[PDB]
Amino acid sequence: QVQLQESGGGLVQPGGSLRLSCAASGFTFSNYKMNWVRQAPGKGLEWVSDISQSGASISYTGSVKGRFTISRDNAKNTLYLQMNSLKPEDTAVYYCARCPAPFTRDCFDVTSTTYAYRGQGTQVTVSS
Amino acid sequence: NYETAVQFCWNHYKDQMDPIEKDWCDWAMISRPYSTLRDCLEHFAELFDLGFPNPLAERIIFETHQIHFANCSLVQPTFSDPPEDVLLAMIIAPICLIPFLITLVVWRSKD
Amino acid sequence: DQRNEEKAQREANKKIEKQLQKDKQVYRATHRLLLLGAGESGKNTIVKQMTSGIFETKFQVDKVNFHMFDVGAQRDERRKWIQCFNDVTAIIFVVASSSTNRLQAALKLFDSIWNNKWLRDTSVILFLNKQDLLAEKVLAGKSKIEDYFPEFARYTTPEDATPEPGEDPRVTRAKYFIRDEFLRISTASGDGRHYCYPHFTCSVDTENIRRVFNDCRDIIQRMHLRQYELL
Amino acid sequence: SIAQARKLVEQLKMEANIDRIKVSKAAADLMAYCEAHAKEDPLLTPVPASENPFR
Amino acid sequence: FLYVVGRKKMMDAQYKCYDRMQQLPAYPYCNRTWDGWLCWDDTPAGVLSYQFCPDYFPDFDPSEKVTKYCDVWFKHPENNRTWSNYTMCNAFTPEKLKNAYVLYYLAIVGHSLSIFTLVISLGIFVFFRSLGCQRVTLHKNMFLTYILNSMIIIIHLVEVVPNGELVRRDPVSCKILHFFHQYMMACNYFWMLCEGIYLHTLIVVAVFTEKQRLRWYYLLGWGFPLVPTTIHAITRAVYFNDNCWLSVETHLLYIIHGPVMAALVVNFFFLLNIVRVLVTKMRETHEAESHMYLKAVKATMILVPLLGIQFVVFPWRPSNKMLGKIYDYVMHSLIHFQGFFVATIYCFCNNEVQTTVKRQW
Amino acid sequence: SELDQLRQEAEQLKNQIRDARKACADATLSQITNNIDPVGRIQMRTRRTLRGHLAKIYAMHWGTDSRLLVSASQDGKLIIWDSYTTNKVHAIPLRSSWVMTCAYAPSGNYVACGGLDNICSIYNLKTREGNVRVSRELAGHTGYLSCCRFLDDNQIVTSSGDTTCALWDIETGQQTTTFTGHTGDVMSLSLAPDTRLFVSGACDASAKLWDVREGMCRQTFTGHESDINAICFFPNGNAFATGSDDATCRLFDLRADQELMTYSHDNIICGITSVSFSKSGRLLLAGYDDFNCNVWDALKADRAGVLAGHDNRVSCLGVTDDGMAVATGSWDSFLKIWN
Amino acid sequence: XKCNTATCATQRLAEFLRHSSNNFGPILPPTNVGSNTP
C-alpha cells in the first residue's frame, strides 16, 4: 500500500526555524514528483512547493520564497522542507503529497479535498 | 561562251513549253519545266566559274515571267494564318470562360 | 435456405449506411468547445451570455455551428474525465484575475492542462475575468499583490503592451503581470502544436463569442497549414 | 472524521478474520484449470480456415 | 528528303516573288529584286532590312535573320557583286545541335524518373486507406495526369521525332497523337490550376468549410481543356494543315497556350496571397526574423513545383547566346523534373505517409 | 484522543493482516510455474475491420451468441455489428454524445450505455416494429458512469465516478443496493461466472470484492502503484487481473488474499487501458497507451505476442464467449477482429 | 514574338532536332553562304 508518513514540526517561536521530514514507502520514489501542501485552520488545501524527479527543478509559492527550502533524497526515500524565519501566518497542517502518475510532468488532484496519495500530515504552530 | 549555254537553256525550255498552250497559268504541270529551267541555268553557270545568280539568268527569268505568265492571278497559299481580328477572336474566346469557371468552382462547390 | 435472409441483411446495412453518411456531414459541421474554470471565475455568467453531469449550449456566429459543454455536478478529482475532450477545437479557461491565493491555484491547474499528454494538441483560450474587480481592489490598496507574488516589485510594463484609454498605470501593471504569469508556462514546452490566446474580459462582455470565433479561426488556419507542412 | 475512522476499523476487523489458504495451493489450482482446458481453447492451437468462421 | 522539299519550296517562293514583282507600284531608293533565295521590296537609301532565314537547308533554322543593305545594294568586297548576308542562319547551328542532344537525353531521363516515382506515389496513396481526404484525391488526379503527360511526351520523343518516313507518309495517327498530347498537357496545366485554387481556398477563404463538391474540380480539370484543343484542331485543319500536325510557325498554338498562361498567373497570385497570409501569421507569433525568413523561403520553395510557377518566373527566352543557353539548361532541367519533385515532396516527405509506412512494417 | 486510538487500532489491524498474508506466502506463482512449457510465440492477424464510427471508440461488448457485438463511440452512436458478415444491424442515436461504456444483455434483448451524464439508459432491441427505443433511464449517481454489466433482463450492476457502485431494478428504476468503501474513482468492474459476486478497481491502487446478495465488501486487495483502469475475472472465478497507470499488470487470488504474479517490462512505460483473459485462462491480453496490444502468458509472465494494427491507443478489448475471436477498439474509430 | 513561350520548349526542341539533326544520321557539309552564293 502506498504510504506517506510525515514527521517533525511543533511549537516554535516567531522568527524561528523548523524541519519537516516525509517518509515514503511502498513505491518507487525516483519515478514520481513530490509536492508540499499545507492547510491553514479554517482554510482549504494550498500548494507550497514541489521538486522534480531528480531534484533539478524546484519551485515555490511566492509567499514562502527564501524562507523555505525543499530537498529530496533518493537513497533514503524521503523528502525535506527546511523552514527559516517563520511568521505567525505559517501555522498550518503540512501534508506530503505525491503526483498520481510516474514518468509524467503534469499531475492533477494534488490539492483536492480527498486524495488517495496524500499523507496524514503534521501540525506546525508559530506563537509565543 | 555562256551565251550559247543560255541559248541552249532557253530554247529547250521553249520547246518543252510548246506542247502546252492552254495551261500556262496552271502550276501543277508548270513546276517541272520551271525547275528544269532553273537547274539548266544554274548548271552552266557553275561550270564556267560564274556565281549564281547571274545577270543573264535574271534577264531570262524576267522575260519568261513577262511573256508566259503575264495577265494571270495568283492562287492562295496552301498554309496561311487567319486574319488578325478573327484569329484574336479564337485566341480570346477560351479566356473569357476562365473567370466564370473560377467563380463557379469557388462559390457553388458546396453541399 | 438463407439467401433471402442474407439479401435482407445487406439491404438493412445500406439503409443504415445512408443515414450514417448524412450524420457525418452534420457532426463535422459543428465545433465542440469545453468550458472550464476555477472557483468564483464567473463562467456561469459567460455561458449564460453564450442533476445531469454535463450541460450543453448551442450558439451561432457568422452561420457557423458551435457546441459548448459545461462540465458540472462532477467530483473535484479531474485527472480522469478530462481525457474525453482531447479532440475539441479549443478549451476556454476562465480565471479570477482579481483574486486564499486563488490565482496561484489557477496557475497550477493551467500548467497541468498545458503539459498533459492528451491535451498537448489542443489550444487554450484564456479569459482574465474580473477585470473590473481587479481595478477597484488595486485602487483601494486591498489587493494582496506583493504578498502572493514578490516579483511585482521588479516588474515593468511590457514594451509592446498598450494601456486601455484612460487607464491608470497601476492597474495596467497588475493586469499585465498576471497575464505574463500564464505566458511563462505557455512559452515553455511549446513546439507549435497548440497555442494560448489570453484576453482581458468581463463577466458580462457580450463580445466573448466573437473572441472565441476569431480564436477558432486562427486554430483552424494553423491546423490546415500544418497538414500542408507550410509551417 | 470520527465516523470515518470507526468504519475503517470495522472493515479492517472484518477483513482480518477471514479464512486463508497457502499461496502454493492457490497457484496449483490456477495451474490445473489451464492445463485441463488447453485443448479446448483457440489462440493456443491454430484452427484451420475450414472450421474458422472469421475466414 | 530535305533537299527535294527545300528545292520545291525555293522554286515556289521564286514564282510567287517574280509574279508579285510587277503588280505593285514603284516608289534614290534601291530597286526590288529577287536575290535568288529571298524576295526583297524597294527600300530607301541608307536602310538596313531584316527577314527571317528560309527553310531550304538542314543547317539553316528559322529563328535567325537575314540582312541586306542599301546605299545601290551592298556589293561584295571581293567579288564586287550584289550580296546578301545569310551567315547568321547557319553560324551557330552545330553547337546548338550539340546542346539539343543533351537536352533531349535529359528530357528522356527526367520523364522516366518522374514516371517511376509517380507510379510508386500513386500506389502508396491507393494502398493506404487511412490517408483518404479531398487533398489526397486531388493529389491522385494530379499524379495521374502527370503520368499520362510524361508517358505521351516520352512516346512522342522516342518514336515520332527520329522517324522521318512516318511523318512523310502522314497517317491520321500523327494528328490523333498530337491532339492527345495537347489535351493531356492542357489537362495537366489546368489540374495545377485546380490545385492552386484548392490551396487558396480553405486557408484564406472558406476556412470553416469541411467538404466541397468535386464535380466542379473535375469539370475544370478534365473537361475544359477539350474546348481549346477542338477549336485549335478545327481551325488548323482548314488553315494550316501541315504534315503530322507538327509545326511552330503557325500562330494558332497561342489558342491553346493562352489559357495555360492565364491559369499560371492566377496560381502565382494565389501563391502571393498565401505567402502574405503565412508571413502575417508568423509575425503575430513574435518569431525570430531569421527563422521567419527561412520558413517563408522554404514555403515558397515547396510551393513552386506544385503550382507550376517556373513558367511565370521565366516566360521569355533571353536574346543573348550565353543567357539563352543558361535559360534553356535551367528551364529544361526544372520542367522535366517537376513531377519527380512534386512526388518526392508531397508523398515521400509527408509526415503522415512516413509514419504510416514505418508503423506498417 | 479517540481519533488517535482509532488510528492506532487501524494500524495494528493492518499489521495483523500483513502478518497473516505473509504466513500464507510460502511460494509464488512464478516458482510453481517454473518447470512448465512456454505457450510459444503468438502470431495473429486481423480478420475483419469495422468502419462507420466518427469519433473515438470508448467501449465494446460481445454477445452470448459470439457473432453479434455492440460498440460505443463519443459521437453519440451505438452500432450493433454482425461480425460474420460485417453488415450493420442497428444504429441507435444517443441523447448525450459523451458516452463512456456499453453492455450487452445475456439474453440479447437489451443494450445499455452511460457516460458523463450520470445516467444509465436501457434500450429494447425486440420492439414490435423493429426500431430501437429507450426502455428505462436509471439515475441517482453523483458521478460519471464508468462501467455497467447485466445480470439478467431485470438487474444490472453499475460503477460511477462518485466512488460508488450500485445494483438496479430495471422494471421499477430503483436502486436496490449501494456499495461503498472506495476512496478513488471506480473505473471498471467484472461479474463472476455465477453472478454471485463482482470485483472492481478504483483510482486508489486498490481492488475490492463485493457480495451482491447482501452488499458488503468482503476482501480488499492492494499492491498496485497508481489508478487501476481495467479489471476482469478469471474463467474459473477464483482469480482476477488488474491493469494500472504504472505500466504493470498484476494477478490476484480470492483465497490467497494477496498478489500472485506481476507482468512488466523495461521498455513499457505506458499504462494499461483494457484487460481480458482467454477461454482457458492461459493467455492474458492487455491494451496499452502506446497504440498496441500485448499478449501475456499468465502462468509464466512472458510476453508471447504483440498486436499493433491500430493508429491510436486501444481503449477497449473483448474476447468471445466461444473463445474463437478477439475484438479491440481504439481512438482511431476502427474496430479490429483478430484470430 | 515563334512559339517562344516556355511551355513550348519541348516542341521547339523536338522540331529543331527533327529538322537539323538529320534523323540522327551522319554529319552533312555546311551550306556555302559565300561570294558565289546569293
3 state DSSP class of F249? strand
Phi, psi of C43 (to 5 degrees): -65, -20
Give the up-direction half-sphere exposure of residue C43: CA atoms within 13 A in the CB hemisphere.
Answer: 21
Q: How many domains does chain C have?
A: 1
- Convert chain C into a string of H (helix), E (strand) and C (coil): CCHHHHHHHHHHHHHHHHHHHHHHHHHHCEEEEEEEECCCCCHHHHHHCCCCCCEEEEEEECCEEEEEEECCCCCCCCCCHHHHHCCCCEEEEEEECCCCCHHHHHHHHHHHHHCCCCCCCCEEEEEEECHHHHHHHHHHCCCCCCCCCHHHHCCCCCCCCCCCCCCCHHHHHHHHHHHHHHHHHHHCCCCCCCCEEEEECCCCCCCHHHHHHHHHHHHHHHHHHHHCCCC
Query: Containing H/E element for E94?
Result: helix E93-127
Query: What are the structural domains of chain F?
Result: 2-339 (2.130.10.10)
- Decide if F226 and A114 are in contact by the 8 Å CB cutoff: no
Contact C149 A62 (CB under 8 A): yes
**E196 close to E267: Cβ distance less than 8 angstroms:** yes
Q: Of E46, E62, E90, which residue is a domain's last?
A: E90
What's the full length of chain B, in residues?
111
Shortest alpha-carbon distance between residue F338 and chain A (Å): 32
Under DSSP, is residue F22 helix (H, G, I), strand (E, B) or coil?
A: helix
Distance between CA A127 and CA F310 in Å, rounded? Answer: 62
CB contact under 8 A, B110 and E212: yes
Rounded CA-CA distance C109/C98 in Å is 17
Considering the domain boundaries, does residue C56 fall inside one? yes
Chains meeting G at 3+ CB pairs closer than 8 A? B, E
Pair E268, E309: CB distance under 8 Å: yes
> Strands F249-253, F239-244: parallel, antiparallel or unpaired by DSSP?
antiparallel
Cell reading at A24: 515514503
Rounded CA-CA distance F317/F338 in Å is 11
Residue type, F309: G
Domain of C123, CATH number, reads 3.40.50.300
G38 touches chain B (CB under 8 A): yes
Measured CA to CA, the distance from residue C47 to residue E75 in angstroms comes to 98
Half-sphere exposure in the Cβ direction for B92 (13 Å, CA): 6
Beta strands at A122-126 and A92-98: parallel, antiparallel or unpaired: antiparallel
Contact C231 E295 (CB under 8 A): yes
Residues E111 and E77 both lie in one domain: no
Contacts of C76 in chain A (CB under 8 A): 109, 112-114
Residue F316 CA to residue F59 CA, distance in Å, equals 5
Q: Structure solved using which method?
A: cryo-EM
Count Cβ neighbours within 10 Å for each residue of C50-59 and write b for 16 or more, e otherwise.
Answer: eeebbeeeeb
CB contact (8 A) between residue C217 and residue E208: yes
Is the four-CA dihedral E39, E44, E45, E51 of positive or negative sign?
negative
Residue type, A49: S
Crossing angle of helices E93-127 and E321-336, in 10° steps, is 20
Nearest to F282 by CA among F264, F268, F302: F302
Chains near F (3 or more Cβ pairs under 8 Å): A, C, D, E
8 A C-beta contact, residue E19 and residue B73: no
Q: CA-to-CA distance for F253 and F270, rounded, in angstroms? A: 25
Helix axis angle for E226-239 and E172-200, nearest 10°, is 150
B94 touches E at CB < 8 Å: yes
E227: part of which helix (H) or strand (E)?
helix E226-239
3-state secondary structure of F260: strand
Amino acid at F301: A
F123 sits in which H/E element: strand F120-124
Q: How many CA atoms are closer than 13 Å to the CA of E214, on its beta-carbon side?
A: 13
Rounded Cα distance between B8 and A127, Å, is 145
Torsion sign (Cα): A58, A61, A62, A68? negative
Taking the CA of residue D36 and the nearest CA in chain F, the distance in Å comes to 8
CATH number reported for the structural domain that contains residue E15 in this entry? 4.10.1240.10
The Cα–Cα gap between A66 and A68 comes to 6
The DSSP H or E segment spanning F222 is: strand F217-222
Give how far Cα G37 sits from Cα of B54, E35, E87, Å: 11, 10, 11
DSSP 8-state code for residue A31: G
CA distance F171 to chain A (A): 36
The resolution in Å comes to 2.8
* Inside any domain, residue B50: yes
CA distance C4 to chain E (A): 32
List, edge to edge, every strand of the sheet that includes A122-126: A11-12, A122-126, A92-98, A34-39, A45-51, A58-60
Contact A88, A126 (CB under 8 A): yes
Contacts of F308 in chain E (CB under 8 A): 359
Domain range holding D14? 2-54
Chain B nearest-CA distance from E178, in A, is: 18
d(CA G27, CA F212): 103
Q: What is the DSSP letter of B53?
A: S
For residue C102, the Cα-to-chain-centroid distance in whole angstroms is 18
The half-sphere exposure of C139 on its side-chain side, counting CA atoms within 13 A, is 8
- What CATH number is associated with residue E161? 1.20.1070.10
- Grid cell in block for residue E36: 535568288
Partners of E70 in beta bridges: E47, E73
**Domain range enclosing A97:** 1-128
C122 lies in a domain? Answer: yes
User: What is the side-by-side strand order in the sheet with A68-73?
Assistant: A3-8, A17-25, A78-84, A68-73
Q: How many residues does chain D have?
A: 55
Q: Sort D2 into a burial class: Cβ within 10 Å, 0-12 / 13-18 / 19+.
A: exposed
Chains E and B are in contact, defined as 3 or more C-beta pairs closer than 8 angstroms: yes
User: For E211, how many CA atoms within 13 A lie in the half-sphere containing its CB?
Assistant: 13
Which CATH number does the domain housing residue B12 bear? 1.10.150.510
Across the interface, which of A47, A104, A113 has its CB nearest the CB of C108? A47
Phi, then psi, of F89 in degrees rounded to 5 = -110, -40
In angstroms, rounded to a whole number, what is the distance separating the alpha carbons of residues C163 and E257?
Answer: 58
Closest CA to C84 of F308, F226, F75: F75
Backbone angles phi, psi at B66, to 5 degrees: -90, -15
CA-nearest residue to F284 within chain D is D43
Cα D45 to Cα D53: distance, rounded to the nearest angstrom: 15
Scanning D1-55 for CB atoms below 8 A from F yields 1-2, 5-6, 8-9, 11-16, 18, 20-31, 33-34, 37-38, 40-44, 47, 52-55
- The answer to whether residues C98 and C137 touch, using CB atoms and an 8 Å cutoff, is yes
Q: Which amino acid is at C196?
A: C
Residue A116 corresponds to which cell in the numbers above?
Answer: 488517495
| Cβ within 8 Å of residue B74, ≥6 positions away | E16, E19, E20
Q: How would you classify the pairing of strands C30-37 and C90-96?
A: parallel
Same domain, E55 and E152: no
Nearest residue of F to residue E352 by CA position?
Answer: F311
What CATH number does residue D10 fall under?
4.10.260.10
Interface test with chain F among E210, E354, E358, E359, by most F beta carbons within 10 Å: E359
Beta bridge partners of F244: F228
Indicate whether B23 belongs to any domain: yes
Q: Which C positions 34-93 lie with beta carbon below 8 A of chain E?
A: 64
Helix ranges restricted to H, E286-319: 289-307, 310-313
Query: Looking up cell 517518509, which residue turns up?
Result: A23
The reply to whether E84 and E217 lie within a common domain is no
d(CA E19, CA E24): 10
Chain E contact present for G28, CB below 8 A: yes
Strand partners of residue B5: none
Contact between E251 and B86 under an 8 Å Cβ cutoff? The reply is: no
Distance CA(C138)–CA(C129), nearest Å, equals 15
E134, E220, E256: best to mutate for the B interface, most B CBs within 10 A: E220
B101 CB near a chain E CB, below 8 Å? yes
Instruction: Tell me phi and psi for residue E147, to 5 degrees.
Output: -60, -45
Domain that holds residue B22: 2-67
F106-141 burial, b for 16+ CB within 10 Å, e for fewer? Answer: beeebbbbbbbbbbbbbbbbeeeeeebeebbebebb
Domain CATH code at residue A108: 2.60.40.10
Distance, in Å, from the CA atom of F224 to the CA atom of F248, rounded to the nearest integer, reads 8
Question: Residue F68 forms beta bridges with which residues?
Answer: F82
> Residue B91 is nearest to which of E15, E194, E254, comparing CB atoms?
E254
Is E351 an 8 Å CB contact of chain F?
no
Binary contact (F88, C27; C-beta < 8 A) = no
Q: What are the CA-CA distances from residue F231 to residues E333, F116, F163, F252, F273 (Å)?
A: 64, 21, 16, 11, 10
**Touching partners of D (3+ C-beta pairs < 8 Å):** F
The three-point CA angle E123-E127-E130 to 5° equals 130
Distance CA C7, CA F221 (A): 52
Supply the range of the domain harboring residue E153.
Answer: 93-360
C-alpha cell at E173: 495517327
Chain D residues within an 8 Å CB radius of F257: 18, 20
What cell numbers appear for E280 in the block?
Answer: 502575417
Edge to edge, the sheet with strand F239-244 lists F228-233, F239-244, F249-253, F259-263
- In E, residues 332-361, which contact B (CB 8 Å cutoff)? none
Do both E234 and E264 map to the same domain? yes
The answer to whether the Cα torsion of E130, E133, E136, E137 is positive or negative is positive
Spatial separation of the C-alpha atoms in residues F251 and F199, rounded to whole Å:
13
What's the domain count of chain A?
1
User: Which residues does chain F have within 8 Å of residue C79's beta carbon, measured at their own beta carbons?
Assistant: 203, 227
Whether a cis peptide bond, with omega within 30° of 0, leads into B53 is yes
- Using CA atoms, how far apart are residues F39 and C111, in angstroms rounded to an integer? 46
Cell numbers standing for residue C139: 485602487
Touching status, chains F and E (3+ beta-carbon pairs under 8 Å): yes
3-class DSSP state of E65: strand
Domain span at residue C198 reads: 31-227
Q: In chain B, how many domains are there?
A: 1
C-alpha cell belonging to residue E125: 496513396
What does DSSP assign to residue B9? H
Phi, psi of C121 (to 5 degrees): -100, 5
Number of helices (H) and strands (E) in chain A: give both, helices first. Answer: 0, 10
Q: Which three cell numbers stand for residue E21?
A: 514583282
Nearest-angstrom CA–CA distance, F225 and F64: 35
From the number of C-beta atoms within 10 Å of its C-beta (0-12, 13-18, 19+), residue A68 rates as buried
- C-alpha cell of F60? 465494446
Q: Is the dihedral of CA C128, C129, C131, C133 positive or negative?
A: negative
Nearest in space to A60 (alpha carbons), one of B85, C197, C107, E228: C107
| Radius of gyration, CA atoms only, chain A | 14
For residue G9, how far is the Cα from the chain centroid? 14
Chain A residues touching C150 at Cβ < 8 A: 62, 65
**What are the beta bridge partners of residue A50?**
A35, A59
From residue F243, alpha-carbon distances to A30, F92, F188, F230, F296 in Å are 22, 31, 10, 5, 12
Instruction: Give the integer Cα–Cα distance in Å for E98 and A28.
Output: 77
Contacts of E25 (CB under 8 A, 6+ apart): none
Q: Is residue C21 part of a domain?
A: no
**F331: chain E residues, CB-CB within 8 Å:** none
Contact status, residue B3 vs residue B60, Cβ threshold 8 Å: no
Same structural domain, E147 and E214 = yes
Mutate: best of G1, G8, G31, partner E, most E CBs <10 A: G31
> Are C170 and C96 spatial neighbours (Cβ–Cβ below 8 Å)?
no
